[PDB]
Structures are given as C-alpha cells and as structure tokens.
Amino acid sequence: VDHCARHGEKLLLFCQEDSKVICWLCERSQEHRGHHTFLMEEV
Amino acid sequence: GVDHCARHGEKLLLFCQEDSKVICWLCERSQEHRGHHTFLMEE
Ligand SMILES: [Zn+2]
Ligand SMILES: [Zn+2]
Ligand SMILES: [Zn+2]
Ligand SMILES: [Zn+2]
C-alpha cells in the first residue's frame, strides 16, 4: 500500500466525496470533515 | 516510541476512554468502539 504525503500513514480509506484514497489522519483533518469513507482491505 | 497493535500491527496512537486502553485506527473503525471517545497521542 502507498502512504500519505501529508501524514505518512497508509492510504487505505477511499473518500467517496473526493473520489480518492486518504489516510486515517486525513479522515480526522478539517479537509475531510463529514466525508463518507470506505475501509480497503490491504491487498 | 509507542507500541504496535497486536491485531493490526499499526501504532497504538489512540486512547479509548470507555475501554481504558490504547488502540490503533483500525481498532477504532470496528463496531467495538462505535461511539467511543478516543484521544490522539503523539510520538
Ligand atoms: Zn493523510
Ligand atoms: Zn474527503
Ligand atoms: Zn488495532
Ligand atoms: Zn473503545
């Protein structure tokens, strides 16, 4: 799996709103406040 | 450094107050803590 440029954490959450993969710290950040995310099983 | 989660291998960077224990972000996503107050720690 790729890691986040902002936070260095695993890119395993798909943000439906932004049509992109984000990390758990992205999900906590103001930038994805209230955004629906889907956990990806690491392949 | 913080310990790593036995179940997921991710850093134990969240404290769950209701469960009185440190968890990782993958633990937090489980329905186990679905509605719990978690605190983010740094290191
Ligand atoms: Zn991120
Ligand atoms: Zn988003
Ligand atoms: Zn965990
Ligand atoms: Zn909990």
PDB file of C-alpha atoms and ligand atoms in Angstrom:
ATOM      1  CA  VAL A   1       0.000   0.000   0.000  1.00  0.00           C
ATOM      2  CA  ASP A   2       1.000   3.649  -0.653  1.00  0.00           C
ATOM      3  CA  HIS A   3       1.486   6.111   2.211  1.00  0.00           C
ATOM      4  CA  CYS A   4       0.030   9.626   2.564  1.00  0.00           C
ATOM      5  CA  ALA A   5       2.174  12.629   1.515  1.00  0.00           C
ATOM      6  CA  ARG A   6       0.692  14.854   4.264  1.00  0.00           C
ATOM      7  CA  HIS A   7       0.791  12.382   7.158  1.00  0.00           C
ATOM      8  CA  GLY A   8       2.966   9.361   6.208  1.00  0.00           C
ATOM      9  CA  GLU A   9       0.121   6.917   7.053  1.00  0.00           C
ATOM     10  CA  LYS A  10      -1.344   4.045   4.998  1.00  0.00           C
ATOM     11  CA  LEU A  11      -3.670   5.113   2.162  1.00  0.00           C
ATOM     12  CA  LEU A  12      -6.442   2.630   2.994  1.00  0.00           C
ATOM     13  CA  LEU A  13      -9.597   4.798   3.164  1.00  0.00           C
ATOM     14  CA  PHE A  14     -11.497   5.628  -0.022  1.00  0.00           C
ATOM     15  CA  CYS A  15     -13.197   9.009   0.284  1.00  0.00           C
ATOM     16  CA  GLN A  16     -16.359   8.855  -1.834  1.00  0.00           C
ATOM     17  CA  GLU A  17     -16.837  12.636  -1.756  1.00  0.00           C
ATOM     18  CA  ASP A  18     -13.365  13.333  -3.157  1.00  0.00           C
ATOM     19  CA  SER A  19     -13.020  10.143  -5.255  1.00  0.00           C
ATOM     20  CA  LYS A  20      -9.573   9.463  -3.791  1.00  0.00           C
ATOM     21  CA  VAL A  21      -7.715   7.425  -1.209  1.00  0.00           C
ATOM     22  CA  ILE A  22      -6.856   9.138   2.076  1.00  0.00           C
ATOM     23  CA  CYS A  23      -5.400   8.054   5.464  1.00  0.00           C
ATOM     24  CA  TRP A  24      -6.897   7.892   8.949  1.00  0.00           C
ATOM     25  CA  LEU A  25      -5.273  11.279   9.799  1.00  0.00           C
ATOM     26  CA  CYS A  26      -6.767  12.761   6.600  1.00  0.00           C
ATOM     27  CA  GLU A  27     -10.138  11.455   7.836  1.00  0.00           C
ATOM     28  CA  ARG A  28      -9.638  13.306  11.163  1.00  0.00           C
ATOM     29  CA  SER A  29      -8.490  16.539   9.412  1.00  0.00           C
ATOM     30  CA  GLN A  30     -10.733  19.530   8.507  1.00  0.00           C
ATOM     31  CA  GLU A  31     -10.197  18.648   4.812  1.00  0.00           C
ATOM     32  CA  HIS A  32     -12.393  15.501   5.107  1.00  0.00           C
ATOM     33  CA  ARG A  33     -14.804  16.651   7.840  1.00  0.00           C
ATOM     34  CA  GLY A  34     -18.092  14.748   7.448  1.00  0.00           C
ATOM     35  CA  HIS A  35     -16.890  12.815   4.375  1.00  0.00           C
ATOM     36  CA  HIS A  36     -18.055   9.197   3.885  1.00  0.00           C
ATOM     37  CA  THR A  37     -15.114   6.754   3.742  1.00  0.00           C
ATOM     38  CA  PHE A  38     -14.771   3.036   2.947  1.00  0.00           C
ATOM     39  CA  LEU A  39     -12.068   0.850   4.511  1.00  0.00           C
ATOM     40  CA  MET A  40      -9.950  -1.002   1.957  1.00  0.00           C
ATOM     41  CA  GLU A  41      -8.621  -4.421   2.976  1.00  0.00           C
ATOM     42  CA  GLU A  42      -4.858  -4.306   2.332  1.00  0.00           C
ATOM     43  CA  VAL A  43      -4.027  -6.346  -0.807  1.00  0.00           C
TER      44      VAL A  43
ATOM     45  CA  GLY B   1       8.070   5.021  20.576  1.00  0.00           C
ATOM     46  CA  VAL B   2       4.507   3.780  21.030  1.00  0.00           C
ATOM     47  CA  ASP B   3       3.749   0.079  20.842  1.00  0.00           C
ATOM     48  CA  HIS B   4       2.143  -1.552  17.826  1.00  0.00           C
ATOM     49  CA  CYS B   5      -1.273  -3.174  17.875  1.00  0.00           C
ATOM     50  CA  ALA B   6      -1.196  -6.979  18.253  1.00  0.00           C
ATOM     51  CA  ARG B   7      -4.207  -7.407  15.931  1.00  0.00           C
ATOM     52  CA  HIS B   8      -3.324  -4.926  13.152  1.00  0.00           C
ATOM     53  CA  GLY B   9       0.360  -4.024  13.545  1.00  0.00           C
ATOM     54  CA  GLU B  10      -0.453  -0.292  13.432  1.00  0.00           C
ATOM     55  CA  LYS B  11       0.909   2.157  16.032  1.00  0.00           C
ATOM     56  CA  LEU B  12      -1.198   2.445  19.201  1.00  0.00           C
ATOM     57  CA  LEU B  13      -1.836   6.201  18.839  1.00  0.00           C
ATOM     58  CA  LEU B  14      -5.413   6.398  20.196  1.00  0.00           C
ATOM     59  CA  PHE B  15      -6.551   6.106  23.826  1.00  0.00           C
ATOM     60  CA  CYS B  16     -10.123   4.856  24.244  1.00  0.00           C
ATOM     61  CA  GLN B  17     -11.579   6.345  27.443  1.00  0.00           C
ATOM     62  CA  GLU B  18     -14.547   3.962  27.769  1.00  0.00           C
ATOM     63  CA  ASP B  19     -12.271   0.928  27.298  1.00  0.00           C
ATOM     64  CA  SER B  20      -9.370   2.452  29.302  1.00  0.00           C
ATOM     65  CA  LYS B  21      -6.807   1.266  26.768  1.00  0.00           C
ATOM     66  CA  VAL B  22      -4.756   2.307  23.781  1.00  0.00           C
ATOM     67  CA  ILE B  23      -5.948   1.165  20.343  1.00  0.00           C
ATOM     68  CA  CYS B  24      -4.985   1.762  16.694  1.00  0.00           C
ATOM     69  CA  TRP B  25      -7.035   3.422  13.998  1.00  0.00           C
ATOM     70  CA  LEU B  26      -8.094   0.021  12.597  1.00  0.00           C
ATOM     71  CA  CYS B  27      -9.356  -0.957  16.079  1.00  0.00           C
ATOM     72  CA  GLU B  28     -11.303   2.350  16.277  1.00  0.00           C
ATOM     73  CA  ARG B  29     -13.128   1.550  12.998  1.00  0.00           C
ATOM     74  CA  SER B  30     -14.537  -1.689  14.489  1.00  0.00           C
ATOM     75  CA  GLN B  31     -18.110  -1.524  15.855  1.00  0.00           C
ATOM     76  CA  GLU B  32     -16.491  -2.345  19.270  1.00  0.00           C
ATOM     77  CA  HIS B  33     -15.830   1.372  19.935  1.00  0.00           C
ATOM     78  CA  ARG B  34     -18.552   2.705  17.607  1.00  0.00           C
ATOM     79  CA  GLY B  35     -19.406   5.870  19.556  1.00  0.00           C
ATOM     80  CA  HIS B  36     -16.408   5.960  21.928  1.00  0.00           C
ATOM     81  CA  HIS B  37     -14.348   8.983  22.933  1.00  0.00           C
ATOM     82  CA  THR B  38     -10.794   8.412  21.592  1.00  0.00           C
ATOM     83  CA  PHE B  39      -7.815  10.697  22.249  1.00  0.00           C
ATOM     84  CA  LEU B  40      -4.962  11.089  19.753  1.00  0.00           C
ATOM     85  CA  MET B  41      -1.452  10.960  21.245  1.00  0.00           C
ATOM     86  CA  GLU B  42       1.894  11.924  19.662  1.00  0.00           C
ATOM     87  CA  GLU B  43       5.273  10.175  19.212  1.00  0.00           C
TER      88      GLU B  43
HETATM   89 ZN    ZN C   1      -3.318  11.638   5.324  1.00  0.00          ZN
HETATM   90 ZN    ZN C   2     -12.839  13.581   1.520  1.00  0.00          ZN
HETATM   91 ZN    ZN C   3      -5.507  -2.238  16.062  1.00  0.00          ZN
HETATM   92 ZN    ZN C   4     -13.415   1.789  22.928  1.00  0.00          ZN
END
